[PDB]
């Protein structure tokens, strides 16, 4: 199924706008996603994912 | 790996301080004065080290008056949220066990809803757990009891994998004493499959139980943990900031300024004679170490002896600070106090009522859909109807229905515009009828008396 994420403002960190055939096309957009670690222990880490 | 289950997460430890302070503010002056070190700094710590300093601080604190506006604000918020009763949608005779005694203690679902809404309005967190014994039991887990939650992507979606909370019991011994035996529940979600394990301690022994996967009536186990962390903002594991923080801070400031004001009132609130231009000769001979001040007796004084009564004048800057903090709390749009002196021209507050009850319209929705999700989990335990809901009172500032209101509702039902059950819910909400709809239908089936 599709998922509709929500990216906080500080996470959106790069983008571009190139005029292609007289149109504004966003050629690039890079944002951050942040999660924990599934160590078998109960300790919590911080992992990073860049989409 | 049977790891540290009493491990409390770092953000939970971070929030415990504010949670405890909010709790003491709710319990009122009894707790605030008891823990006065955290709230009211000592006027002079150098003296405070000395025993006369601690005696002075005890006198300074005992004279203080805690305003108790946080308790009234919370109480008022719940009053608007819980008027008449929350509405249950779906089958009712097939769900009566979750309604009459929600957790097998004779406590109705609406009273647990009241407790949960209060706990979410006070410190902005909560929890509802669903477990299968037969009958499903809805739990209520305080903000301070949830101590671990792990979130990752399972199939590329924000999923809750680990969740540990605390359970507290009182051992059934032969005597009458009370003990607090403690239970830890570990909820795990591996590879899209729910799991549950139990930890308990008693008589100096930590026990571990086998992993179990509670299954629905039709089977296929469970795909998500039956636990919602309902808060001020949303039902996400991340801590939602307590909505009561600002009001508490203002009330603490008002409390310490009240301490200052009361010290001033006790010391310099009584007039004093201040007999200037007086000699010990005059005192010891004619005054004789005593003065009669009443109207019946007249006291003489020597030349250039000016008497003048001194007392601290009113409207001091401490009192204006106190009044400003009372007004600041009112400005913070908090239902802590009601002023009869102030007046309102009607029709104005109708615009702001939307913003006045934002927190209410938000916590009500959060608690409502959290309870709806929990009831859907219970239904999947019993394979009952899954398209059921639970809604709180979304219409605040309730009041009795006027004759025009009642007549308009009747006419709106005589037209095919409002449902009959909706009409009856209107009339009950406005306090104009009390019996159930079906009992009324049965009473109105018979021919009219005439």
């Amino acid at each position: 199924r599709p998922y509709i994420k929500f990216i906080a403002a500080e996470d959106i960190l790069n983008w571009r706008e190139r005029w292609v055939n007289g149109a504004k096309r966003t050629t690039l957009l890079v944002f951050r996603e942040e999660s924990d670690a599934d160590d078998d222990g109960y300790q919590i880490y911080k992992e990073e994912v860049w989409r | 790996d049977s790891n540290n289950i009493k491990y409390v997460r770092e953000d939970a430890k971070k929030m415990h301080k504010l949670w405890a302070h909010i709790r003491m503010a709710m319990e009122g002056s009894r707790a605030i004065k008891d823990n006065a070190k955290e709230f009211v700094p000592h006027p002079d710590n150098t003296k405070a080290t000395t025993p006369e300093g601690v005696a002075r601080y005890k006198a300074y604190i005992e004279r203080a008056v805690w305003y108790g506006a946080s308790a009234n604000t919370v109480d008022g918020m719940l009053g608007q949220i819980f008027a008449r009763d929350p509405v249950f949608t779906g089958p009712e005779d097939k769900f009566d066990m979750l309604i009459n005694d929600v957790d097998g203690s004779g406590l109705s679902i609406h009273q647990q809803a009241r407790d949960s809404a209060e706990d979410a309005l006070s410190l902005g967190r909560g929890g509802l757990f669903v477990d299968y014994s037969a009958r499903p039991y809805i739990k209520f887990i305080a903000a301070e009891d949830i101590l671990n939650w792990r979130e990752r992507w399972v199939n590329g979606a924000k999923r809750t994998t680990l969740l540990v909370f605390r359970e507290e019991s009182d051992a059934d011994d032969d005597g009458y004493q009370i003990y607090k035996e403690e239970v830890w529940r570990e909820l795990r979600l591996v590879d899209g499959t729910y799991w549950q394990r139990t930890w308990r301690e008693n008589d100096g022994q930590l026990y571990v139980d086998d992993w179990i996967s509670p299954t629905k009536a039709d089977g296929s186990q469970f795909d998500e943990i039956p636990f919602v962390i309902f808060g001020s903002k949303n039902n996400d594991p991340t801590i939602d900031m307590p909505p009561m923080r600002d009001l508490v801070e203002l009330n603490i400031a008002h409390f310490r300024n009240s301490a200052d004001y009361e010290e001033a009132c006790f010391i310099c609130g009584q007039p004093t004679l201040f007999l200037s231009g007086l000699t010990e000769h005059w005192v010891k001979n004619v005054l004789g170490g005593a003065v009669v001040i009443g109207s019946r007796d007249a006291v003489p004084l020597p030349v250039n002896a000016k008497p003048e009564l001194l007392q601290a004048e009113g409207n001091g800057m401490v009192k204006e600070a106190m009044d400003q903090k009372e007004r600041q709390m009112v400005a913070l749009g908090a239902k802590l106090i009601d002023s009869d002196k102030t007046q309102r021209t009607f029709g104005e507050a109708s615009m702001e009522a939307a913003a006045q009850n934002s927190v209410l319209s938000r916590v009500s929705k959060n608690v409502s859909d959290a309870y709806t999700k929990a009831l859907r989990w219970a239904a999947m335990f019993l394979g009952l109807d899954e398209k059921i809901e639970y809604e709180l009172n979304s219409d605040f500032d309730i009041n009795k229905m006027s004759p025009e209101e009642l007549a308009a509702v009747i006419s709106a039902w005589q037209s095919n515009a409002i449902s009959f059950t909706e009409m009856r819910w209107q009339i009950k909400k406005g306090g104009r009828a009390y019996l159930e709809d079906e009992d009324m239908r049965n009473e109105s089936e018979q021919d009219d008396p005439l």
């Binding site: 160590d39 078998d40 222990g41 109960y42 300790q43 | 790996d1 790891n3």
Partner: protein
């Protein structure tokens, strides 16, 4: 407790009797504080053998 709470009497006579007071024995409950010696649990040793800290 009042030790001499019941005393004989002679209804035919009128003699003096001494008064008795109410004492209040007080109980007690001491507090004992215990603790744990410091334990060195560096994560280095646990991680060197693949055990979570």
């Amino acid at each position: 407790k009042i030790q001499g709470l019941v005393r004989p009497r002679d209804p035919y006579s009128n003699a003096d009797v001494a008064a008795k007071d109410l004492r209040q024995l007080v109980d007690n409950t001491i507090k004992v504080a215990s603790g744990t010696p410091p334990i060195n649990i560096p994560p280095s040793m646990l991680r060197w053998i693949q055990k979570n800290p």
